[PDB]
Amino acid sequence: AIPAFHPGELNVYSAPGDVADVSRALRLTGRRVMLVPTMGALHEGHLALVRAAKRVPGSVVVVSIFVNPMQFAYPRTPDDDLAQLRAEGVEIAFTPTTAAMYPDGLRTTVQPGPLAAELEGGPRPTHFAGVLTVVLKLLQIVRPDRVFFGEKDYQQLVLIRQLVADFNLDVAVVGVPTVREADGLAMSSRNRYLDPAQRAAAVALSAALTAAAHAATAGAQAALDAARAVLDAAPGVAVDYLELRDIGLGPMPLNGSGRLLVAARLGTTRLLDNIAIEIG
Amino acid sequence: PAFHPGELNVYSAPGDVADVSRALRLTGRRVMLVPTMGALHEGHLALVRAAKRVPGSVVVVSIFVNPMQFGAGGDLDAYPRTPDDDLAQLRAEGVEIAFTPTTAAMYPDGLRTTVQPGPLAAELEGGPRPTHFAGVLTVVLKLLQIVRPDRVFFGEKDYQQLVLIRQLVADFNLDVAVVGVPTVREADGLAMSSRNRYLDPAQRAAAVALSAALTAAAHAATAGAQAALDAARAVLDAAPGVAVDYLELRDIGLGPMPLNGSGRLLVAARLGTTRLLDNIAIEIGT
Numbered sequence: 001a002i003p004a005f006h007p008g009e010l011n012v013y014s015a016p017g018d019v020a021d022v023s024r025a026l027r028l029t030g031r032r033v034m035l036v037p038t039m040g041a042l043h044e045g046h047l048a049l050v051r052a053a054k055r056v057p058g059s060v061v062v063v064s065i066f067v068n069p070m071q072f073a074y075p076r077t078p079d080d081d082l083a084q085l086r087a088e089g090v091e092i093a094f095t096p097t098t099a100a101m102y103p104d105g106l107r108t109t110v111q112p113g114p115l116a117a118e119l120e121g122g123p124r125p126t127h128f129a130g131v132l133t134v135v136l137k138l139l140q141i142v143r144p145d146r147v148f149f150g151e152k153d154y155q156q157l158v159l160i161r162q163l164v165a166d167f168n169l170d171v172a173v174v175g176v177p178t179v180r181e182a183d184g185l186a187m188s189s190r191n192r193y194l195d196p197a198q199r200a201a202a203v204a205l206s207a208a209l210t211a212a213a214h215a216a217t218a219g220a221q222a223a224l225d226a227a228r229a230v231l232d233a234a235p236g237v238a239v240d241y242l243e244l245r246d247i248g249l250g251p252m253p254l255n256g257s258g259r260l261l262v263a264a265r266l267g268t269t270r271l272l273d274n275i276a277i278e279i280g
Numbered sequence: 281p282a283f284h285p286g287e288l289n290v291y292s293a294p295g296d297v298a299d300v301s302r303a304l305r306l307t308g309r310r311v312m313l314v315p316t317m318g319a320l321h322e323g324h325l326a327l328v329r330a331a332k333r334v335p336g337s338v339v340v341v342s343i344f345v346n347p348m349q350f351g352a353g354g355d356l357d358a359y360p361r362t363p364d365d366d367l368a369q370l371r372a373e374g375v376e377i378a379f380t381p382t383t384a385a386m387y388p389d390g391l392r393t394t395v396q397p398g399p400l401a402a403e404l405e406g407g408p409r410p411t412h413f414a415g416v417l418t419v420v421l422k423l424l425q426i427v428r429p430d431r432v433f434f435g436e437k438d439y440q441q442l443v444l445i446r447q448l449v450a451d452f453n454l455d456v457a458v459v460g461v462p463t464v465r466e467a468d469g470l471a472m473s474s475r476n477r478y479l480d481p482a483q484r485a486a487a488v489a490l491s492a493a494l495t496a497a498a499h500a501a502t503a504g505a506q507a508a509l510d511a512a513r514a515v516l517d518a519a520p521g522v523a524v525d526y527l528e529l530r531d532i533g534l535g536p537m538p539l540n541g542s543g544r545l546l547v548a549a550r551l552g553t554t555r556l557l558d559n560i561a562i563e564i565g566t
């Protein structure tokens with residue numbers, strides 16, 4: 001017997017089987033199930049995922065809130081997150097416990113391809129296994145038609161595309177453009193940790209990337225050099241990498257579409273950003 | 281793509297069987313999946329029959345000699361391929377779908393994202409072959425995603441493989457029921473296997489010691505674990521030219537738990553270059 005679902009209201013489920021049964025029943029009624037995976041502490045960046053999901057005709061939006069210990073006190077405002085979702089007209093929140101997600105501990109897991117050891121995988125060599133493992137599980141629990149990820153974490157988005165292709169998953173992966181503060185800083189929960197000198201310096205990540213994207217008419221080296229100049233003008237910004245790659249994060253082609261990605265530490269706060277680049 | 285019912289329909293393209301499967305499921309039919317590497321014998325046909333008896337089912341039998349679950353050199357080229365016989369057997373069984381993918385269609389990016397099994401995969405069959413079960417669970421995952429069956433069928437013969445498939449399915453919340461089917465045996469007890477064709481008359485005669493030892497142990501087990509294990513071992517010791525790789529008594533889930541009353545006794549032995557497996561349910565004190 002299928003759990004209670006009240007249309008037009010926020011329905012919250014903590015049991016994987018409960019959201020699974022409702023998702024299945026809803027799909028049979030001709031809803032298209034959209035999945036928005038989050039780790040809570042929702043800002044406008046996450047709302048852009050929600051709104052992207054909402055605009056699909058027939059959508060019912062499932063937002064998972066689950067702090068996945070496998071990809072690591074993280075920020076935790078449960079009541080506030082649910083209010084944001086309620087305000088957005090999301091009808092399903094999925095809020096499992098760790099015990100619910102991992103009843104048998106870490107046993108079978110996803111091993112990502114080699115890209116998981118590069119870029120963000122340098123400092124954190126197991127982070128992406130954690131991500132792909134919990135993503136695969138949510139996909140199987142919820143069985144969405146489409147799943148939504150922000151372009152801000154571009155490498156995560158690329159690896160999710162690889163997970164979906166590699167395991168023949170029947171879901172469309174949708175990347176949603178980065179939401180930015182008024183000065184271009186990519187929205188992130190971490191931003192609140194920056195002191196005022198750090199927050200002023202943080203602007204150099206996005207400024208560096210936009211410079212590069214416009215410098216790119218003069219070629220790949222001019223793009224990279226323009227980006228480095230901007231980063232070089234910021235104090236207290238320790239660049240971990242600044243790398244131009246093709247859109248699938250392979251080596252950058254001589255001409256064509258690429259992505260430029262940057263990561264930097266401002267004190268104890270690590271920030272990432274990335275931008276589309278067209279070479280020449 | 282076309283699907284003619286009451287006939288065997290062979291699809292090579294994953295997209296083709298995916299479309300047909302989905303179409304069938306929407307029309308009411310329940311999809312049964314029986315994954316094989318071909319070279320079918322009566323053991324595989326019990327799997328088919330178990331699938332076939334599920335009411336309203338359509339049966340998909342996949343045939344794919346999965347390069348990822350083989351080590352080098354060596355073994356992959358040596359696995360028997362008898363596809364004419366296979367398809368004929370499936371037709372004779374009233375199976376409606378054979379799925380026969382190419383390596384390129386399954387591994388267009390080579391080994392990129394893969395399944396990493398739990399620690400069980402390092403044990404028993406995994407000992408000499410530490411990448412073996414990653415290969416199996418990777419292809420089984422992909423098959424379940426392509427075919428999206430209601431239930432998937434595996435033999436008890438490869439009992440550790442069954443256990444790990446159950447782990448895959450639990451751990452990744454796969455929406456499929458795993459059905460284990462009892463081992464089909466020759467008249468004397470020899471567990472049916474594609475490997476048996478590599479036993480000459482003498483080795484074939486000796487090979488009965490595997491099932492003899494396990495059934496003796498299952499009967500001796502009223503007298504406890506030591507008695508069960510020592511009975512099996514005596515039968516194996518008395519068998520000409522059987523080299524035992526392992527004989528282990530484990531809990532039914534094979535994992536980080538002690539044996540109590542209920543267990544599984546598993547044997548692997550070499551007859552010349554041919555490596556044979558068998559296992560049996562054990563009840564201690566029963």
Ligand SMILES: Nc1ncnc2c1ncn2[C@@H]1O[C@H](CSCC[C@@H](O)CO)[C@@H](O)[C@H]1O
Pocket residue numbers: 037038039040044045046048049068071131134135148149150151152153176177178179180186187188
């Ligand atoms: N500023 C932003 N703009 C757009 N998307 C964003 C932003 N900030 C965060 N997100 C997006 O919000 C999601 C964060 S939680 C991801 C869960 C996954 O790891 C599995 O556990 C992710 O899709 C970010 O890329």
Ligand SMILES: Nc1ncnc2c1ncn2[C@@H]1O[C@H](CSCC[C@@H](O)CO)[C@@H](O)[C@H]1O
Pocket residue numbers: 315316317322323324326327344346349416419420433434435436437438441461462463464465471472473
């Ligand atoms: N004698 C038997 N009785 C019952 N089932 C059997 C027997 N012999 C083999 N099988 C069963 O036939 C299947 C072999 S193909 C497994 C495919 C996997 O590695 C990924 O490609 C397996 O379910 C055996 O346990």
